[PDB]
Design a protein around this ligand. Structure first.
Ligand code: NI
Ligand code: NI
Ligand code: NI
Ligand code: NI
Ligand code: NI
Ligand code: NI
Lengths: 100, 101, 566, 566, 566, 100
């Protein structure tokens, strides 16, 4: 596989997102770290699918709503940023106010 | 498209050109297999291999570098040898020469 | 005897006339020469050639090399050749034919009992990369870069502080001393840049005397004509290099004013295209001058479909700008121009831009300097075809031009080419071994100062080193005292004389920088073009001799999704 | 010109009269003072104030600071104020107004070419925490504590051995020497405690002469009147501190006998409430005495619904007790009392208990000293309302009282307040930067001796430091020689004079403890109350001046599920 | 008073006559002796025995031990006994009865204020393992081995280079010096092997003078009679050991020729069964000679159903062989013989093979030396029943015979038994504590030089050290200067005299090898059998005194799927 | 649990395989690291089930086909090797040309 440090670092993000995913599925209101991981992992898969940076900057604001997270969480996340290998290389996706 | 693929031009490579060679019939008289490398001093191989050790003096197998010739017990075959170069000094092996020649 | 060419390639790697595809790009290299004697190639293993009295001789350690890379396909600015590489005392001993003079002909690299062997047949070997635009935001950057194939890192910073987030500056004697001490812990060669933004010479001389090998002039600290003149004056007297990030705001003058302030003195211009910082919108016109050594940072390389979209927010965070402050967003926008971004790739292909760098974690990706340089070459071959300099049906010249961008040229620009930058005798043995299918993406072995420092390694408890999971792990060359012996901390001549290494008790080997004032554009290997370039103030169109320079954005790139897990 | 207060706060952080919520608690702090001159605030970034000739001057390194934290909201025992913080030579230089005297007014902290900048606008800055109840069970504890905001760790141990599992003791010269050497590898200030349980003075003097800064008297090694008297006698002559864990079993006498054995001599009582160890059920009555410096360990803080349930098995494992041995389970039970646990929170609110600590991995959580201290403050505000000392509509006084519990008070108790413990000029620059939304939970930056040692860091290969995943990673201040220069190993005066640092070849900076015998309850900042407290032998009810002291257990706490992944 | 035997065992561990099952195998050990005085056992904890004036005395540090392992069940080549173990100055002080002479009888191990305690009741304590077949392919191997219970690693290599992948050789002075320096960073005792394949004595003397404690003769570098004679001649004059991997190809002669070249001189034969390398198919006949110290590498141990199948491809990768080259695959096949693999297990049971080793990442598993040794013992008990030497209804003798294979015998073979290899007074305190249910699989504590170096550790932030997740983490004994003080770098007598340690500035403790030339088969503890063994040239059948030696392959093994997550 | 370094290393392989598994499920053509992880994790579970080394050396060549991976990937993987604890201890499984 020859995994570089950055690929191994992203495995941490993926795993953190699995935790949140299962909790959201149980019907829990997600907390700060769970919310960040879930939306981040969503964007990484988007890039793997071949979606554009522009499309993800938009789609990322529709993963979680204010009613699916704990109080104060939306305000603790003014934006989320994550990079992934798009068909045209590594790009940065910045989602402003992801939770509304 | 194959990542890092070679595009080897067709043909052949002539090995150890411009060097003295000689053919020798060798026979394994031992009860166990013997395998000889391309750069081993042929005259000092396992004593169970019977051949003209005198003719093989200062020679090695005329085969591509890193390959070998195997002799199963009782096997007889003719091999081609190529003379050593450089200083033509033989050190090591069975310690029969340990000097120039 | 005789052997077919294909079987030969499978055993010893390709030879004269054979071509190899670089990773999954459209770039092909052709072996130009082979320094071996057919039939006398050295090979290691069970019953192979490198054995006592055979491919290995009887000489003492002093008369043989410590390490030999057998049957390597060298790719360097001077040639693409097949040869054995000998390393002795941590330095490149010779490029030639290895073996035992006692029985083999034409041996120039003697193998003895004291010789270790690295099998490079079927592999490409290059010099270690040199990134001269490092922001020391975190120490983890060194491992990321080393894994990518970069063995020397020049930059500035003190950690995740606002000043370092924005600029490559290690401010003053205390922080400089602290970072020189911390550098001993990192497995790469390191040189530091001080804060050059001051109009009082002595404040700069102190920093140079403390250890920095250069001074960074950054607009965030005030890139005014006075500061620029001051830094260049000190640089001229202490033989150190100046790196520039000009006044984007045109607050103190336009690009012509900065150029006038520079006054024909040697200077390295960072991210000359402008997105990373610089007079809007024409900082790119600097590549026309003889005293300017121009480089690019990597996010704009090469021009792709998602390039523009990701730049705005990246710009803001890197420079502590407020998106609610209109003036802050207006000046961020003026830096991102499709016109100059598209032209930059072509200027690299023509040799007008001579270096590539990262701009690590401050509008740049530390592990992607090499990878992006090759993606640009690919996109340029695809769009523009063969270079006027090409000979034969291969991309050899374009390959030599581009490899020079992250190896010898950065070394020359910063006064360290006497130590590193290329595979030449006497230079530190910083080498990178690659499998052709992974060239420029994931190395097979990274060697620092004659010792392997990092490499892919499988299951530690396995019966062999190949079983999964295989990922990059630090080797002996990255450990304690062995590391100190295999890395270099570069100092200014003044610091070296002042006994800074003794005072701080630096454990690593020390190297001094020199020749930073005498390098000019004409000295950049294969990248010395000085075009009559102009930028349209209104449309931002870049023209050379009146002709429009431009290119098309890529939708898909090689060395991308086929290799990475994320 | 003029600017609205809201817009002002968004740019430079809050000012006089503005209030800020501490994390998700009900505690609000109000800015008491602002040392700036409106319009002259320093800000760093593209086109900002800190630039050559502007907010940055022409002075040499000697005349300017090495680091400035701009627009910081300081929260310390002496005040909650807005100011710039200057750091020079690894120490706090000044708290005032930073800038360039050449063009700005009232500049007390000069910024020059040698100055690095940390932007603290919108952030709260505090001194690093000090945990004086560490069990050196594993080295990983140092990173856990550093990440939480604790920069100094005092305790004892040799690793995961039975003796250390139960007690904070580094037994004898050999182990002490070994741990002093190992301490150089850790990114926190360290001081060691020896085994004080012996009735032969010389056996204690040897340990002090070897390097310990204090002696732990623990019941597991025999907390008898003879041992206690012996340790205090040696402490009185060598100026070191004694930490006590009394005889829970009442085997040698009751609490009054221990107090009599102490005989009015200075002593630090660990986990004074009793659950962590001590005369059952009245060890808590010790907080009434002038010579007793009382602290709490963290699992009982604050009283919650699950507190009692988790304590029994925790007790057993920590002290190597056998649940099958009736006497072992009976004495475990006698330590866990709802009555004293509920009273403890109130005693902290009143200032009767002066310190908070962990009791790491031996009935305590190393990364939760700060977090739990604030949870207690929250629960007390919610239950008891404003303190009699409060002025204005804020919780400023309660905040100053509680912050003193893990900063200045532990420093005073152990004789290291001359070096660390608060943000005052001349003290080591151990600072912690927090975002208000994460105060007391997850720091933005942890600074050790003037260098950032650990901080949250995003993708190493990213274009900026913010992309996910963001987690705590070691910075340059935690690396090799830079670390040695930024941390302190505390020694007893005898060890320092004996040349222990030279003999063991300790690489870090050395600090000596002093003033351990002269501190008394009256010296504990904002926590000097000596109540007439009594404990009912049968009911365990705690009363002060006859009134019953108690509180209600929390079902939900702030700084909990909203921040942690697990 | 009186106490039942079961209750006694639950409190202090088993005593004389009690039997304990080793992990999940069929091997049972019976306590042969107990050095305590019933009623006077020392126990630590709340209200236990080790307290001031009670089980702890008033003596100064010089008159008491630094560490005591209480109520340990010792398993060593000399006995299986219950006793307290005292450690002083990093070395084994005594095996006896610990306590306070002031009130207790028969105290031979005094406990004082300077004494740390490790509770070993219910645990088995053994000496640290010694692996003499290490390929230094990566530094991560040291942690893997330490975690398994191996504290000394002897081998050669320079990292993931072809030469090291195939052979245990650190070629020449430069690489030797580099690896000696890197060794200071590893938490295990280390000794290096040089490349012994040369027919020029001086080329070997240089390597020995540079620091190696032995010379590896490997067929990949040419295992010819001349090279073998040369290495043995130098070994005879410099008192170092020679490890042999003979000529599998029978290229220079058959096994009888090699044996003749050896000429009765002492030599350690690696993987004597042959799969790992050696004259095909009879290298195994070497175990009949008095001057041969024979060992096995671990993949063939013990003979199981999947053994043969996994060997071919493992063989190829380890020796850089080409599966397309017929001669390369034919010689790989001739090394894998069901007949010799089956016989090897029996020869170990009989004491004809005296050592077990790994052959780490080059046809061997670094973390499985101990584990596999016990699996062989289990399979042999199951198949052959009790050994002729057994006394009583237990497997005590078979246990002593097998433990000697990875402890004292490797130590004797390499000239380091004066320092390590067994639990005897004066030897370095390298000890491993095991819980009976996990014996040989996962240790409870690994002690290096008197300090815990690695151990299972739970949640760092937990209230106790036991909460999940529990996994192996480095302790204080593996940190910086404490590590240097607790590990040994073994040097040849010549290197020691030449001042190599001073020249390279080695920080760790130094030990010199001696007695490598005088050890013979008769000296191998419990494994000195010299059988009249023969191998059939055609059928490969192994016979001793004409009787066929063989065994059956296991389908399921203990110490396997019940303990590992993967 | 007392996880040794090697057990923790394998958790990295398992997690990498979860990533690939989800992508294969979405209908994506797997890349180099994803392919190696998926086939490797398959073999480890085979060993946990008690399958022989011989059976796995064969079965491993039928996890992914040339049509389920990106171009060039089959040629980048001449073989896959992984070790796992079989009922009879640790053994090495080598699958030659796993993708066809
Ligand atoms: Ni810039
Ligand atoms: Ni930059
Ligand atoms: Ni206690
Ligand atoms: Ni405690
Ligand atoms: Ni071998
Ligand atoms: Ni080996």
């Amino acid at each position: 596989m020859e995994l570089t440090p950055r690929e191994k670092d992203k495995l941490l993000l993926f795993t953190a997102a699995l935790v949140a995913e299962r909790r959201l599925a149980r019907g829990l209101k997600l907390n700060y770290p769970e919310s960040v991981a879930l939306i981040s992992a969503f964007i990484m898969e988007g890039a793997r699918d071949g979606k554009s940076v522009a499309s993800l900057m938009e789609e990322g604001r529709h993963v979680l709503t204010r009613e699916q997270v704990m109080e104060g969480v939306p305000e603790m996340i003014p934006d989320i940023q994550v990079e992934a290998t798009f068909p045209d290389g590594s790009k940065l996706v910045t989602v402003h106010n992801p939770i509304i | 498209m194959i990542p890092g693929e070679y595009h080897v031009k067709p043909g052949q490579i002539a090995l150890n050109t411009g060097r003295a060679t000689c053919r020798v019939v060798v026979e394994n008289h031992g009860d166990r297999p013997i395998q000889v490398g391309s750069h081993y001093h042929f005259a000092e191989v396992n004593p169970a291999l019977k051949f003209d050790r005198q003719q093989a003096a200062g020679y090695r197998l005329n085969i591509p570098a890193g390959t070998a010739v195997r002799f199963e017990p009782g096997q007889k075959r003719e091999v081609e040898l190529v003379a050593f170069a450089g200083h033509r000094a033989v050190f090591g092996f069975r310690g029969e020469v340990m000097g120039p020649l | 005897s005789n052997i077919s060419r294909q079987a030969y390639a499978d055993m010893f790697g390709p030879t004269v006339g054979d071509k190899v595809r670089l990773a999954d790009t459209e770039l092909w290299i052709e072996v130009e020469d082979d320094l071996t004697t057919y039939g006398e190639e050295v090979k290691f293993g069970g019953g192979k050639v490198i054995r006592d009295g055979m491919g290995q001789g009887q000489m003492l350690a002093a008369d043989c090399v410590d390490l030999v890379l057998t049957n390597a396909l060298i790719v360097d600015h001077w040639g693409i050749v097949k040869a054995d590489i000998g390393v002795k005392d941590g330095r490149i001993f010779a490029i030639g034919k290895a073996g035992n003079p006692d029985i083999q002909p034409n041996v120039t690299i003697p193998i003895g009992a004291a010789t270790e062997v690295i099998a490079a047949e079927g592999k490409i070997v290059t010099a270690g990369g040199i990134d001269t635009h490092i922001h020391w935001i975190c120490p983890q950057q060194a491992e990321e870069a080393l894994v990518s194939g970069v063995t020397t890192m020049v930059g500035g910073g003190t950690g995740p502080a606002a000043g370092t987030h924005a600029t490559t500056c290690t401010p003053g004697p205390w922080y400089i001393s602290r970072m020189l001490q911390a550098a001993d812990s990192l497995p790469v060669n390191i040189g530091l840049l001080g804060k050059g933004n001051v109009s009082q010479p002595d404040a700069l001389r102190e920093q140079v005397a403390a250890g920095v090998i250069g001074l960074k002039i950054h607009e965030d600290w005030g890139a005014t004509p006075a500061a620029i003149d001051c830094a260049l004056t000190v640089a001229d007297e202490m033989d150190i290099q100046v790196a520039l990030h000009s006044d984007t705001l045109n607050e103190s003058g336009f690009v012509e004013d900065t150029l006038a302030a520079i006054g024909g003195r040697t200077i390295h211009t960072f991210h000359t295209e402008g997105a990373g910082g610089g007079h809007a919108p024409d900082i790119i016109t600097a590549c026309a001058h003889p005293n300017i050594l121009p480089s690019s940072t990597n996010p704009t390389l090469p021009y792709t479909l998602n390039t523009i979209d990701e730049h705005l927010d990246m710009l803001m965070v890197a420079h502590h700008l407020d998106p609610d402050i209109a003036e802050d967003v207006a000046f961020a926008e003026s830096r991102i121009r499709r016109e100059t971004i598209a032209a930059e790739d072509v200027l690299h292909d023509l040799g007008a831009f001579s270096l590539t760098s990262s701009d690590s974690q401050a509008m740049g990706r530390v592990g992607e300097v090499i990878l992006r340089t090759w993606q640009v070459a690919h996109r340029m071959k695809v769009q523009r075809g063969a270079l006027a300099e090409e000979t034969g049906d291969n991309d050899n010249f374009r390959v030599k031009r581009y490899i020079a961008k992250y190896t010898i040229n950065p070394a020359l620009t910063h006064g360290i080419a006497h130590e590193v930058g290329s595979i030449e005798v006497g230079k530190l043995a910083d080498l990178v071994v690659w499998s052709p299918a992974f060239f420029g993406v994931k190395p097979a072995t990274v060697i620092k100062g004659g010792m392997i420092a990092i490499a892919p390694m499988g299951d530690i408890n396995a019966s062999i080193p190949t079983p999964q999971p295989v990922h990059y792990r630090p080797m002996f060359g990255a450990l304690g005292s062995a590391r100190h012996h295999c890395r270099l901390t570069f100092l200014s001549q003044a610091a070296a004389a002042n006994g800074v290494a003794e005072r701080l008790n630096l454990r690593s080997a020390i190297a001094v920088v020199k020749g930073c004032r005498t390098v000019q554009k004409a000295d950049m290997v294969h990248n010395s073009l000085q075009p009559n370039i102009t930028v349209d103030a209104q449309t931002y169109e870049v023209r050379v001799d009146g002709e429009l320079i431009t290119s098309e954005p890529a939708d898909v790139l090689p060395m991308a999704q086929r290799y990475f897990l994320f």
